[PDB]
Amino acid sequence: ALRPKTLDEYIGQERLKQKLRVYLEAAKARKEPLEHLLLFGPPGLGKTTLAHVIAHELGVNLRVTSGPAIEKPGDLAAILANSLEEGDILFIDEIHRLSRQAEEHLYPAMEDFVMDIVIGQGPAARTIRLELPRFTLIGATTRPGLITAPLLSRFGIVEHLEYYTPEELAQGVMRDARLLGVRITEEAALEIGRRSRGTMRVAKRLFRRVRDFAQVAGEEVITRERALEALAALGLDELGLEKRDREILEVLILRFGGGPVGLATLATALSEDPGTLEEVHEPYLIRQGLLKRTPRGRVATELARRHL
Amino acid sequence: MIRYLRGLVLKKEAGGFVLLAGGVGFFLQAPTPFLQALEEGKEVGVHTHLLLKEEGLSLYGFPDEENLALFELLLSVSGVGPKVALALLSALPPRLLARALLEGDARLLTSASGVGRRLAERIALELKGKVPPHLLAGEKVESEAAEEAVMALAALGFKEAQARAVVLDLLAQNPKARAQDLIKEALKRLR
Numbered sequence: 001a002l003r004p005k006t007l008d009e010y011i012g013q014e015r016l017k018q019k020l021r022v023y024l025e026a027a028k029a030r031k032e033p034l035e036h037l038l039l040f041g042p043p044g045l046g047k048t049t050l051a052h053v054i055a056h057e058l059g060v061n062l063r064v065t066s067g068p069a070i071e072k073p074g075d076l077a078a079i080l081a082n083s084l085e086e087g088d089i090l091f092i093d094e095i096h097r098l099s100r101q102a103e104e105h106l107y108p109a110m111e112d113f114v115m116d117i118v119i120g121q122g123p124a125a126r127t128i129r130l131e132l133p134r135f136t137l138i139g140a141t142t143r144p145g146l147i148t149a150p151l152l153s154r155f156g157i158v159e160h161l162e163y164y165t166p167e168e169l170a171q172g173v174m175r176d177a178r179l180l181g182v183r184i185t186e187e188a189a190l191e192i193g194r195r196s197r198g199t200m201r202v203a204k205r206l207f208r209r210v211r212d213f214a215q216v217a218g219e220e221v222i223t224r225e226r227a228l229e230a231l232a233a234l235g236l237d238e239l240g241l242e243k244r245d246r247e248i249l250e251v252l253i254l255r256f257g258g259g260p261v262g263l264a265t266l267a268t269a270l271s272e273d274p275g276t277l278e279e280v281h282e283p284y285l286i287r288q289g290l291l292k293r294t295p296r297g298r299v300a301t302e303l304a305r306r307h308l
Numbered sequence: 309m310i311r312y313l314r315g316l317v318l319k320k321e322a323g324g325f326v327l328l329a330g331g332v333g334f335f336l337q338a339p340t341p342f343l344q345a346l347e348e349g350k351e352v353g354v355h356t357h358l359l360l361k362e363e364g365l366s367l368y369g370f371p372d373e374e375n376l377a378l379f380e381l382l383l384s385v386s387g388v389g390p391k392v393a394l395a396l397l398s399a400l401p402p403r404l405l406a407r408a409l410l411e412g413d414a415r416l417l418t419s420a421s422g423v424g425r426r427l428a429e430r431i432a433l434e435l436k437g438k439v440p441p442h443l444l445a446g447e448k449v450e451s452e453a454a455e456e457a458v459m460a461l462a463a464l465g466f467k468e469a470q471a472r473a474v475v476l477d478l479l480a481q482n483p484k485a486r487a488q489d490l491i492k493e494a495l496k497r498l499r
């Protein structure tokens with residue numbers, strides 16, 4: 001389900017824009033190369049679809065590739081060497097995770113559009129150059145902190161991204177009520193809105209599966225009754241926090257107590273991938289008076305227990 | 309007719325030297341520079357230039373096609389002979405002389421043994437523009453763009469052969485292939 005790519009059709013914050021819409025206006029005040037744009041903030045938030053759309057309001061296609069998805073140190077070279085049209089965009093997701101050097105043979109495409117390939121056997125010889133076209137690079141990171149090496153220099157503008165309010169996400173959801181055979185109401189949709197932890201991603205998950213479900217196609221309609229009904233019901237979860245989350249807490253609080261544990265044990269007692277824990281569950285929890293990371297280990301905030 | 313020759317440097321000289329190609333001891337004049345970088349005993353190739361006369365035949369040798377080129381071109385002008393052309397060639401480097409000849413530095417020409425005042429001028433006005441395609445910089449090929457291609461490829465990941473084995477096949481379908489246009493086009497078939 002494609003969407004008419006624009007910026008006027010982009011549900012979301014107006015800050016990065018106050019300092020990007022402006023440079024988006026520079027690609028028409030100077031040339032086509034709009035400084036390397038890195039992206040921060042938590043997942044879902046909207047990264048791809050941003051520039052995936054930015055492109056069209058620029059005049060060039062878009063090529064996007066995940067970082068770690070780079071074995072051959074020349075896979076990007078190939079992603080640079082003939083495949084563009086003097087403007088196309090190259091998006092690099094999970095960019096912070098690139099080969100020790102792969103990220104070094106990435107600076108050439110910074111100053112302008114080169115890709116000088118050092119070479120030598122002993123004693124090393126000269127150094128080869130190519131002719132990568134002029135393009136705009138988007139390299140987003142899910143966890144920038146201190147993993148986006150000095151390459152932050154080569155990147156043009158560094159703007160952050162955060163969660164898009166119950167309103168904004170709920171807002172989107174509305175336009176998402178015009179899909180294929182379903183009408184939902186606002187206030188209701190507001191329900192959904194706050195269960196999509198400030199994330200469009202978790203803002204459609206709920207329904208996507210709802211599709212192929214028995215007792216939901218007969219009552220297709222969805223108003224603030226079904227909204228919070230087949231949501232608190234078999235949509236299996238109250239305010240965001242869902243099954244596995246309850247389970248977590250349940251084990252966090254019941255087995256261990258409100259006491260601290262440490263990804264160490266807990267991730268195992270939860271029979272889970274420690275990384276996958278603190279990374280794909282622990283998140284929302286914390287950012288919602290629930291989970292607390294302590295040098296002693298995780299712990300349950302009161303508002304968790306009484307909450308159930 | 310005779311343009312090239314291989315033989316020993318049998319014996320050198322002030323402004324000449326003898327090439328024992330075949331069984332014949334040929335005697336040719338050359339530019340001092342070239343002349344000096346010449347050592348009796350070692351084989352050598354010479355870009356020659358025959359020249360009839362009314363008393364005998366003359367041979368003029370040169371380091372490389374470039375030089376020979378100028379020497380002729382030079383002789384091309386009315387009034388300039390082998391001596392002069394030679395001087396000029398013996399004085400300033402070809403490249404610089406090629407430019408000069410094109411542009412018309414009767415000033416720079418004079419600035420050289422056989423320093424001709426008005427002659428440097430004639431020679432100038434006379435070849436202004438009339439000089440030269442591939443002659444502003446001594447033709448010299450760098451590295452085997454082919455291999456060079458590969459060499460890059462290898463260092464970019466691709467196991468050597470994998471890369472070489474398709475660089476060749478590329479030069480096949482397309483002999484003209486700067487490492488660049490060659491290399492890239494490999495990534496394509498190496499996806």
Ligand SMILES: Nc1ncnc2c1ncn2[C@@H]1O[C@H](COP(=O)(O)OP(=O)(O)NP(=O)(O)O)[C@@H](O)[C@H]1O
Pocket residue numbers: 003009010011012043044045046047048049050093172199200201202
């Ligand atoms: N701001 C938005 N406005 C309209 N649709 C959106 C927006 N953001 C995301 N979507 C839609 O949500 C889906 C992708 O979800 P999501 O993971 O949140 O965004 P993304 O940019 O594709 N991913 P990422 O790069 O990992 O942040 C697509 O089918 C889009 O149509």
